[PDB]
């Protein structure tokens, strides 16, 4: 028996695109346990898909996430992808950020971190953050504020994350859509 | 933040060897993959004079072929190609299987009995691929499938002792293509 939803428990408390979303993010790596430790805010799936339909930039902290993203069915939407490291410090460009972006972080936590500092302070509005770096040693921290922030979110509790699945978080939230 | 610095000492481990694990890491962020991944004493070798020659690549599934990236391998003149379309009989996976071109890579990012079927194949000396990237998703068959992928005689990347698979299938394949280019 090879069927997905067979392997996994039952994830009935979520909604049909959160269970899509996990399903994908278990394809990609192989790791069950994702589908315990995503976490997503309350209305995170209307913000992102709101944000999509009006044609939002999306913008990435490296360029692998970029890579990884399903770049025909963005720009079918009207979407424009961008990259913060390729003044001209990435910092200046996040802070330029226009309002109601996707943000998705793959790697740097302290981009992450410098992102929760900006939007407690008002300077930026993104629509969406995907907040999944890699598990340097500030990383669980980051992750902890974006968890207190009131601007929507997905994000991983532990040390999984990473460009696949920052950009593989999107595709799944573009797919359905 | 550099990834040299988060993981273990590497230096006794070739340049590509080590460029492939690097991407695994930055694709799913389990550094424990720097032991989990096995690559037969052939592998890197026959991949890449595979890949030079434009080989035919296979996957088990079409998610596995998507995330391949395949500007690069038609530069190099590789065709790409699925086993199961929509995951007696005329097309069904396992004659499709049978009809691997010699020398093709075939990565299998899914399914336990496509591996399973391709190790018979190989055994009975049916089939004879470049590489075999086994690399399925932990159903109950997948223990019993990568160990004989282990013991097989091709040349072959697998995954054991990490829950590792899915689309690392084509992260590997992509970093073997980013090397040669």
Known sequence: QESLKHLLPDL??????????????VLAC???SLVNAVRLSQGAIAS??????????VVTDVPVVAAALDQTRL??????????????HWQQRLQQIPQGSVLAIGYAPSVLLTACKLIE??????A????????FSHAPGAKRRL?????????????????????????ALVETL
């Open 12 to 25: 009935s408390a979520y909604s049909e695109i959160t269970i899509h979303l996990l399903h994908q993010l």
């Open 30 to 32: 192989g790791d069950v």
């Open 48 to 57: 992102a898909r709101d944000a999509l339909k009006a044609g939002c930039p």
């Open 75 to 88: 720009a079918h939407l009207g979407c424009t992808v961008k990259t913060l490291i390729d003044h001209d």
């Open 121 to 126: 302070q008002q300077h930026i509005q993104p």
């Open 128 to 135: 969406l953050v995907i907040g999944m770096p890699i598990g």
């Open 147 to 171: 968890m207190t922030s009131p601007i929507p979110h997905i994000t991983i509790q532990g040390s999984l994350g990473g460009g696949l699945l920052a950009a593989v978080t999107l595709n």
